[PDB]
Paper text:
Adenylyl cyclase 9 (AC9) is a membrane-bound enzyme that converts ATP into cAMP. The enzyme is weakly activated by forskolin, fully activated by the G protein Gαs subunit and is autoinhibited by the AC9 C-terminus. Each membrane AC contains two conserved cytosolic catalytic domains and twelve predicted transmembrane (TM) helices, with cytosolic N- and C-termini of varied lengths and regulatory roles. Here, we present the cryo-EM structures of AC9 in several distinct states: (i) AC9 bound to a nucleotide inhibitor MANT-GTP, (ii) bound to an artificial activator (DARPin C4) and MANT-GTP, (iii) bound to DARPin C4 and a nucleotide analogue ATPαS, (iv) bound to Gαs and MANT-GTP.
To better understand the observed extended density protruding from the nucleotide-binding site, we determined the structure of AC9 in a complex with DARPin C4 and an ATP analog ATPαS (AC9–C4–A) at 4.3 Å resolution. While ATPαS is also an AC inhibitor, it lacks the MANT-group and is likely a better representative of the nucleotide pose in the ATP-bound state of AC9. The structure of AC9–C4–A is very similar to AC9–C4–M, with the full model and soluble domain RMSD of ~2 Å and ~1 Å, respectively. The absence of the stretched density observed in all of the forskolin-free MANT-GTP-bound structures indicates that the stretched density in AC9–C4–M and AC91250–Gαs–M map corresponds to the MANT-group. A similar conformational change is also observed in the AC9–C4–A structure, indicating that the overall domain rearrangement is primarily driven by the DARPin C4 rather than by the ligand occupying the active site of the cyclase. The similarity of the MANT-GTP and ATPαS-bound state of AC9–C4 complex indicates that comparisons of distinct MANT-GTP-bound states provide a valid interpretation of the conformational transitions stabilized by different AC9 activators in the presence of MANT-GTP as a nucleotide substitute, at least at the resolution of our 3D reconstructions. The DARPin C4 binds to the C2a domain of AC9 at a site that partially overlaps with the Gαs-binding site. A partially active state can be formed upon DARPin C4 binding.
Numbering used by the authors:
A (entry chain C): 9 to 136
B (entry chain A): 97 to 197, 217 to 262, 278 to 359, 384 to 552, 566 to 574, 780 to 939, 976 to 1250
Write the structure that this text describes.
């Protein structure tokens, strides 16, 4: 919003893992899908820093499922890039598309393959 | 401005001609009506007064045909002079034989008024003679009518008429001058704007290739046009890339004047790129002693390798010819490669079209590995070479490559003027109508005094409103005035003008409501004053035409049509005749002035339109000029042909990302996103330069993925209250802020670390400008290649520094650690020092 220090502060608390700050900001009308200048998202930052509890807090806070950066990557692609199975599971149970791809033009299968993580590959290859 | 003020009336002829011809028609027609009057109806006792009418008819038709002559283009002024002299004599003669107790004063005063107006408006003569003739005519008429209050009234009528006339004359003159001046400006601007367009197009084609420029000057990308106040990059296959470097380049630059080098390189590269356009291969850029080109970059060609090899041979031929010419023994290392490359433009400052791959580095290295005087072709070049030349294999003795040796004018001000005129002339007309009384001091009607008061109040309020609006008095407050001004649009002007133009007729009828039908002098006086009033109804040229014409005619004559029945009839017929003529005058005259106002407006708008169109083009061109060269050499070339200079000491830093080499994943179609991110990174790097304190730093150019900058040369001004060495330190913190920015972006970069090799040096260098009809500023010297090589022998995240620069910086506060000993070409062994301290774990 106007003078949206709420967005940057919620993002910094999101990748900081400071839960109480995120709760306080949520009580302060924090924009759930507030992003940076580059288009990264609090869910993506939570995937980066591996604060899963922040992932659940944000998804129950009213977060989206196909958040895209300037690189356009959906959080499914980001998590398949990391190698964390639990984050992938808790995001795919929301119903993220697997037949789509970001502007890099590759499915999450490809990014699971080149990042060497098999677990994500069998998880996605069972999907429709 | 004698030439100016002569051409001014050089351009004003046909309008003057048209006014003259209308004047002649009118005077003839009026004389004909008075001949008819004197002949058929009344005055049947004499033929004396019709022969002069007939002769004036014939002199009019004579002038009508006379105007066509060639002894007229510089003699029409005195032609009008002689015609007005004729009219003067005829009018006074028609007056002379009167006062029998044979014509009333109404006809005399009429014919006086039309003579005076056709004098003032159309004849187009200088001011002082016009006014002296007017006053002479006035006095002659008023003293020849004697053959005193009534006479004094007539004289005051003369003065009011003269005021109206002189005002209208001045207005016509000013409006005539201004339109010619404005159209002159509008004519002047177009040629300069066309010149500026050509300069802009030339410079655009200079900084960047033919194909993209011709695609984009139809503004196919609006982002490109807004940026050049954005573009696209591609990837291409099977292209030839050639490099060449001067052998012993430092040797020719031992102790010269740093000037012959600039010119000789100009000539060399002119020959080379001349042969380039004559051989259908496209140059890219140069690095000091290195000149390199590509073939089939913007549009691939089937036989580009042949063009590339022929360029190599032609370069060999040109260098050997120049060696035979000026007698300098030089040879020219050549390298050639074929492969795939992605081409595009990086940055928004000093941006130049360029190409990228591993193949470009491979070609540069294989040039460095070849032998001088022979081109080093590759197996990739040999896949389709058709072996129509000498096949010789030359390999490094210390990849399937071979060696080939060859073969005023303000609308609101006029409102002040004409309101001033209306109020003063109306006030004087009321003065005289009040002055009619000689025997009775008080007027029996009060309505005259009531109307006088209403008029004086309305005129003074309008006057004070106008003077506040024009002078910007704001004597009480601004916002009260503002809501006292905005109302006047198209309708308020119509209505206030209608009232202000009508009201003198009501003023003259102030006195006629009482008795005038008994005595005979009263009615003749009313006729005189009413025509005097009705003629005044033309001034307010800011209004429209038909409104003022109809208003003046109705509210000035129709009341006499009403008072005609209150019964003297023969005087009635003559006075309706004179008023018919008078309205005939006013219609044409007011039309003639409204059209001139309209055309003046139609001109001034386009004048300012073109004036605003030129300015953006000028600023755009100046910005592009600033894009390429420094301002100093720009203003120096404004009086010169070339540029060349030396500096005995200057600092320079080189910097390039090192871990970019693994980041060329090409799974994506084109791999364009990574270079996009690089583009925002370098754009941020340029935005860093935008700080006002950064006037001491010169980013030379972008070199592939690298970044080179210098300092301490733009400072041509030296002060004794200053230390002339602070440029080196400030450039050192410039490197520091570069380090900080790349660290911050690495933080903001998603899962990839960016590290860079950076090296610093300082020494004597030289500067010059190369391209002609193209442009490129560049630097050479002994320490530039040394700094590049030492930066090549650098460590990531470490500021490698030359030994002498280390010495000059150690006492400045910064602390370093010795790294090791590095042997470098040209200067031999050299020591190396590192700025970062305790960065790693050990």
């Amino acid at each position: 919003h106007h003078g949206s220090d709420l967005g940057k502060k919620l993002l910094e608390a999101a990748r900081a893992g400071q839960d109480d700050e995120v709760r306080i900001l949520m009580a302060n009308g924090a924009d759930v899908n507030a992003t940076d200048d580059y288009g990264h998202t609090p869910l993506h930052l939570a995937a980066w820093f591996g604060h899963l509890e922040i992932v659940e807090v944000l998804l129950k806070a009213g977060a989206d499922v196909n958040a895209a950066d300037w690189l356009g990557d959906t959080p499914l692609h980001l998590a398949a890039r990391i190698g964390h199975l639990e984050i992938v599971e808790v995001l795919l149970k929301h119903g993220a598309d697997v037949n789509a791809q970001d502007k890099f033009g590759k499915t999450p299968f490809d990014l699971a393959i080149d990042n060497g993580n098999e677990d994500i590959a069998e998880v996605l290859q069972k999907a429709a | 401005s004698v030439n100016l003020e002569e051409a001014c009336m050089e351009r004003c002829f046909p309008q003057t001609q048209r006014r003259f011809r209308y004047a002649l028609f009118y005077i003839g027609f009026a004389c004909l009506l008075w001949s008819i009057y004197f002949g058929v109806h009344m005055k049947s006792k004499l033929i004396v007064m019709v022969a002069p009418a007939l002769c004036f008819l014939v002199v009019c038709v004579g002038f009508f045909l006379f105007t066509f002559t060639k002894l007229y283009a510089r003699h029409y002024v005195w032609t009008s002079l002689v015609l007005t002299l004729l009219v003067f004599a005829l009018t006074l003669a028609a007056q002379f034989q009167v006062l029998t107790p044979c014509l009333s004063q109404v006809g005399s005063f009429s014919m006086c008024i039309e003579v005076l107006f056709l004098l003032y408006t159309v004849m187009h003569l200088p001011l002082y003679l016009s006014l002296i003739l007017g006053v002479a005519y006035s006095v002659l008429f008023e003293t020849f009518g004697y053959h005193h209050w009534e006479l004094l009234s007539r004289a005051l009528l003369h003065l009011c008429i003269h005021a109206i006339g002189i005002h209208l004359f001045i207005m016509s003159q000013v409006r005539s001058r201004s339109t010619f001046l404005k159209v002159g400006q509008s004519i002047m601007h177009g040629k300069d704007l066309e010149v500026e367009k050509a300069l802009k197009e030339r410079m655009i084609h200079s900084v960047m290739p033919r194909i993209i420029a011709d695609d984009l000057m139809k503004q196919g990308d609006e982002e490109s046009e807004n940026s050049v106040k954005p573009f696209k990059m591609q990837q291409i296959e099977e292209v030839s890339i050639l490099f060449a470097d001067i052998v012993g380049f430092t040797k020719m630059s031992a102790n010269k004047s740093a000037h012959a080098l600039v010119g000789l390189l100009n000539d060399l590269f002119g020959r080379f790129d001349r042969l380039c356009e004559e051989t259908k291969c496209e140059k890219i850029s140069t690095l000091g002693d290195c000149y390199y080109c590509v073939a089939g970059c913007p549009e691939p060609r089937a036989d580009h390798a042949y063009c590339c090899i022929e360029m190599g041979l032609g370069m060999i031929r040109a260098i050997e010819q120049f060696c035979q010419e000026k007698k300098e023994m030089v040879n020219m290392r050549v390298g050639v490669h074929t492969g795939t490359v992605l081409c595009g433009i990086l940055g928004m400052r000093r941006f130049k079209f360029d190409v990228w791959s591993n193949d470009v580095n491979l070609a540069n290295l294989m040039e460095q590995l070849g032998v001088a005087g022979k081109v080093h072709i590759s197996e990739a070049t040999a896949k389709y070479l058709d072996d129509r030349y000498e096949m010789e294999d030359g390999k490094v003795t210390e990849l399937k490559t071979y060696l080939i040796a060859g073969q005023f004018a303000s609308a609101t001000f006029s409102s002040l003027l004409d309101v001033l005129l209306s109020t003063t002339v109306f006030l004087i007309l009321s003065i005289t109508c009040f002055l009619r009384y000689g025997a009775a001091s008080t007027p029996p009607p009060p309505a005259a005094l009531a109307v006088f008061g209403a008029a004086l109040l309305l005129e003074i309020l309008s006057l004070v409103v106008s003077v506040r609006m024009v002078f910007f008095l704001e004597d009480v407050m601004t916002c009260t005035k503002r809501l006292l001004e905005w109302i006047a649009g198209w309708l308020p002007r119509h209505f206030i003008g209608a009232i202000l133009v009508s009201l003198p007729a009501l003023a003259v009828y102030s006195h006629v409501t009482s008795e005038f039908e008994t005595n005979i002098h009263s009615t003749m006086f009313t006729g005189s004053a009413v025509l005097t009033a009705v003629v005044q109804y033309c001034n307010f040229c800011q209004l429209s035409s038909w409104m003022r014409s109809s208003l003046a005619t109705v509210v000035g004559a129709g009341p006499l049509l009403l008072l005609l029945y209150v019964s003297a009839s023969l005087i009635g017929q003559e006075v309706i005749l004179v008023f018919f003529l008078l309205l005939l005058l006013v219609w044409f005259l007011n039309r003639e002035f409204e059209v001139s106002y309209r055309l003046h407006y139609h001109g001034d708008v386009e004048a300012d339109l073109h004036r605003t169109k030129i300015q953006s083009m000028r600023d755009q061109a100046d910005w592009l000029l600033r894009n390429i060269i420094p301002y100093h050499v720009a203003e120096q070339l404004k009086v010169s042909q070339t540029y060349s200079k030396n500096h005995d000491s200057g600092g320079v830093i080189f910097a390039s990302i090192v871990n970019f080499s693994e980041f060329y994943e090409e799974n994506y179609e084109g791999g364009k996103e990574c270079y996009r991110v690089l583009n925002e990174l370098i754009g941020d790097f340029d935005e860093l330069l935008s700080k006002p304190d950064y006037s001491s730093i010169e980013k030379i150019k972008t070199i592939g993925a690298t970044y080179m900058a210098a300092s301490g040369l733009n400072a041509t001004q030296c002060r004794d209250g200053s230390h002339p060495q602070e440029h080196l330190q400030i450039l050192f913190e410039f490197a520091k802020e570069m380090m900080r920015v790349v660290d911050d972006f690495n933080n903001n970069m998603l899962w990839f670390n960016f590290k860079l090799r950076v090296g610093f040096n300082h020494g004597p260098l030289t500067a010059g400008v190369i391209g002609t009809t193209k442009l490129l500023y560049d630097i050479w010297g002994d320490t530039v290649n040394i700094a590049s090589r030492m930066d090549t022998t650098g460590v990531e995240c470490r500021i490698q520094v030359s030994e002498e620069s280390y010495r000059v910086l150690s006492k400045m506060g910064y602390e370093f650690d010795y790294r090791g000993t590095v042997n470098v070409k040209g200067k031999g062994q050299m020591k190396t020092y590192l700025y970062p301290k305790c960065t790693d774990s050990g």
